Amino acid sequence: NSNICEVCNKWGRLFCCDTCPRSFHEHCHIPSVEANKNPWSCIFCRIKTIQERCPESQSGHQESEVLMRQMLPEEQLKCEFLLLKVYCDSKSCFFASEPYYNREGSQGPQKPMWLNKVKTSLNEQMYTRVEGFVQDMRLIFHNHKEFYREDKFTRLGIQVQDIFEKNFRNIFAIQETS
Ligand SMILES: [Zn+2]
Ligand SMILES: [Zn+2]
Ligand SMILES: [Zn+2]
Known part of the structure; x- marks a missing residue:
């Protein structure tokens, strides 16, 4: 994974995505990074999944x-x-x-x-x-x-x-x- 936050480009306490190499500070991610959940998928991954499930959504x-x-x-x-x-x-x-x-x-x-x-x-x-x-x-x-x-x-x-x-x-x- 990346060693800087995807949003603000700073290091710190980062949470790592399990399905892509992005990382986030807790309150930089939107919604704020969820408490438990292993694996965890970031918002970029979740959006990509919507698109893959319904390819026609990109028309x-x-x-x-x-x-x-x-x-x-x-x-x-x-x-x-x-x-x-x-x-x-x-x-x-x-x-x-x-x-x-x-x-x-x-x-x-x-x-x-x-x-x-x-x-x-x-x-x-x-x-x-x-x-x-x-x-x-x-x-x-x-x-x-x-x-x-x-x-x-x-x-x-x-x-x-x-x-x-x-x-x-x-x-x-x-x-x-x-
Ligand atoms: Zn950040
Ligand atoms: Zn991700
Ligand atoms: Zn479909």
Whole structure:
């Protein structure tokens, strides 16, 4: 197995996947690495298994249909994985914890949002449809773009949104378009 966490790229107290060479800190993995369970399979392995069991699940889909899906176990897992893929980018640090807004010439958002809040919301089964999760994720970046206006720091929101969107299209097998 790897000797660094797949998500944050640091060593420490790591839990090793039994079915691939990846390793994780406890709370870097999503869901948090399960207490017992030998063997243990990581979220990358669990997603791969879904795909292998239903090869047709990789045919293209319409985003509108994906968003209306109820958060049954497989959709719950796909959203957990998509959230984890965002945390895998180091630029996710800017969006992880609760933000505050005090900048001359800007007003903070009506509905603040951040990655750890989405993480808790998933853990607590607060989303009933995929749409709920995707709306909160997109809100994170939209709030950032709006608040930072013309400051070049706005680009961090663009960059992390692009990682989110690319992974959304891959995980949920959204039909390719120009
Ligand atoms: Zn980690
Ligand atoms: Zn694995
Ligand atoms: Zn089948």
